[PDB]
Each structure stands twice: as structure tokens, then as C-alpha cells.
Design a protein around this nucleic acid. Structure first.
Length: 50
DNA sequence: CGCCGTGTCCCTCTCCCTATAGGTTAGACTTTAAGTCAATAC
């Protein structure tokens, strides 16, 4: 209910889907390099469970 | 007020019927490759 009432009032500004095609879109829009460097930074500085 | 260890638990691995339209095959007709005989010459 919440989802349909956001999309029919705020139809622009974003794209939202459901299912495996959405996961495929996520993998499409995913920079492996910057995320990997962020993980390197986290291991370099962070500690604990993180 | 803001994050970190210990504990418990969940999970995984191992030893009905009707009506229309169209495709398929089986069955027979005429043609052809095939088996056959008779006389002959060297």
C-alpha cells in the first residue's frame, strides 16, 4: 500500500522494481572498484564487528 | 548517550460432449528395373 501510494504521487525522482530483474539492474549499476576501495578503507581504519 | 563480547538458537553437512478445419496415411493404377528363354556364332 505504501509503495503504490509513493509511486502514484512521486512517480518521478526514482526507479523501483521487484524481483530478479531488479537485482540485475542493481548489478548493472554497481561500481566494483569504488566499493572495493571503500571496503579497504574500512578494514584499514575500522575495527570490531564492522 | 554510544558502541562491543557472550549466549542461545536455527540451520547445514557428515557418518464431459459437440462442431470445423486441416494434416496424415493406406490403398489402388501405370510405369520401370529385373529376371527369363530361345536361337546363334566363334
Amino acid at each position: 500500500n505504501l509503495y503504490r501510494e509513493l509511486v502514484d504521487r512521486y512517480g518521478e525522482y526514482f526507479t523501483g522494481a521487484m524481483g530478479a530483474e531488479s537485482i540485475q539492474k542493481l548489478i548493472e549499476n554497481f561500481d566494483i572498484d569504488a566499493e572495493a576501495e571503500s571496503l579497504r578503507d574500512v578494514i584499514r581504519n575500522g575495527k570490531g564487528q564492522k
